[PDB]
From Swiss-Prot, chain A:
Protein name as catalogued: Glutamate receptor ionotropic, NMDA 1
Phenotypic consequence of M40I: In NDHMSD; likely pathogenic; may affect glutamate-gated calcium ion channel activity; decreased sensitivity to magnesium block
Intervals, Cytoplasmic compartment: 15-26
Impact upon substituting A36V: In NDHMSD; uncertain significance; may affect glutamate-gated calcium ion channel activity; decreased sensitivity to magnesium block
Region Pore-forming, residue ranges: 2-23
Recorded domain comment: A hydrophobic region that gives rise to the prediction of a transmembrane span does not cross the membrane, but is part of a discontinuously helical region that dips into the membrane and is probably part of the pore and of the selectivity filter.
Origin species: Homo sapiens
Ranges that cross the membrane: 27-47
Originating gene: GRIN1
Disease listed for this protein: Neurodevelopmental disorder with or without hyperkinetic movements and seizures, autosomal dominant: An autosomal dominant neurodevelopmental disorder characterized by severe intellectual disability and developmental delay, absent speech, muscular hypotonia, dyskinesia, and hyperkinetic movements. Cortical blindness, cerebral atrophy, and seizures are present in some patients. Neurodevelopmental disorder with or without hyperkinetic movements and seizures, autosomal recessive: An autosomal recessive neurodevelopmental disorder characterized by severe intellectual disability and psychomotor developmental delay, involuntary and stereotypic movements, spasticity, and inability to walk without support. Intractable seizures manifest in some patients.
Assembly and binders: Heterotetramer; the NMDAR subunits are modular and harbor tiered domains that function in concert to regulate opening and closing of the cation-selective ion channel pore. Forms heterotetrameric channels composed of two GluN1/zeta subunits (GRIN1), and two identical GluN2/epsilon subunits (GRIN2A, GRIN2B, GRIN2C or GRIN2D) or GluN3 subunits (GRIN3A or GRIN3B) (in vitro). Can also form heterotetrameric channels that contain at least two GluN1 subunits and at least two different GluN2 subunits (or a combination of one GluN2 and one GluN3 subunits) (in vitro).
Recorded consequence of changing I41T: In NDHMSD; uncertain significance; changed glutamate-gated calcium ion channel activity; mutant channels are activated at 2-fold higher glutamate and glycine concentrations
Ranges within the bilayer without spanning: 4-14
Swiss-Prot record, chain B:
Family: Belongs to the glutamate-gated ion channel (TC 1.A.10.1) family. NR2B/GRIN2B subfamily.
Residues of the full protein shown: 599 to 642 of 1484
Subunit structure: Heterotetramer. Forms heterotetrameric channels composed of two GluN1/zeta subunits (GRIN1), and two identical GluN2/epsilon subunits (GRIN2A, GRIN2B, GRIN2C or GRIN2D) or GluN3 subunits (GRIN3A or GRIN3B) (in vitro). Can also form heterotetrameric channels that contain at least two GluN1 subunits and at least two different GluN2 subunits (or a combination of one GluN2 and one GluN3 subunits) (in vitro). In vivo, the subunit composition may depend on the expression levels of the different subunits. Found in a complex with GRIN1 and GRIN3B. Found in a complex with GRIN1, GRIN3A and PPP2CB.
Intramembrane sections: 4-15
Subcellular location: Cell membrane; Postsynaptic cell membrane; Cell projection, Dendrite; Late endosome
Associated disease: Intellectual developmental disorder, autosomal dominant 6, with or without seizures: A disorder characterized by significantly below average general intellectual functioning associated with impairments in adaptive behavior and manifested during the developmental period. MRD6 additional features may include seizures, hypotonia, abnormal movements, such as dystonia, and autistic features. Developmental and epileptic encephalopathy 27: A form of epileptic encephalopathy, a heterogeneous group of severe early-onset epilepsies characterized by refractory seizures, neurodevelopmental impairment, and poor prognosis. Development is normal prior to seizure onset, after which cognitive and motor delays become apparent.
Tissue-specific expression: Primarily found in the fronto-parieto-temporal cortex and hippocampus pyramidal cells, lower expression in the basal ganglia.
Record annotation: effect of changing A38P: Severely reduced localization to cell membrane
Official protein name in the record: Glutamate receptor ionotropic, NMDA 2B
Organism: Homo sapiens
Length: 48, 44
């Protein structure tokens, strides 16, 4: 599932919809959650 | 099942704060291209 885990970052940073694969293990989900966080806190700041 | 009209719908929705469900492509090259288009839309 390496390809899906590679697509996930690009599909969560570029606001796209390409690729439908989500983390399954709980121990790796929480990290991915804050990943989404980082997304906003960069792009919005850029616009500002 | 990917026509030449069901792609303008996806790209228009994507350029316009993607909210409506559409049908994504399947080829890798099309994936990278729609990703580039997403970058364009966010910058614009």
């Amino acid at each position: 599932t390496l390809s899906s885990a590679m697509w996930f970052s690009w599909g969560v940073l570029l606001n796209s919809g390409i690729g439908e694969g989500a983390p399954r293990s709980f121990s790796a989900r929480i990290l991915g959650m804050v990943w989404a966080g980082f997304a906003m806190i960069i792009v919005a700041s850029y616009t500002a | 099942s990917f026509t030449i009209g069901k792609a303008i719908w996806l790209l228009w929705g994507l350029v316009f704060n993607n909210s409506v469900p559409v049908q994504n492509p399947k080829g890798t090259t099309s994936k990278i291209m729609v990703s580039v288009w997403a970058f364009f839309a966010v910058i614009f």
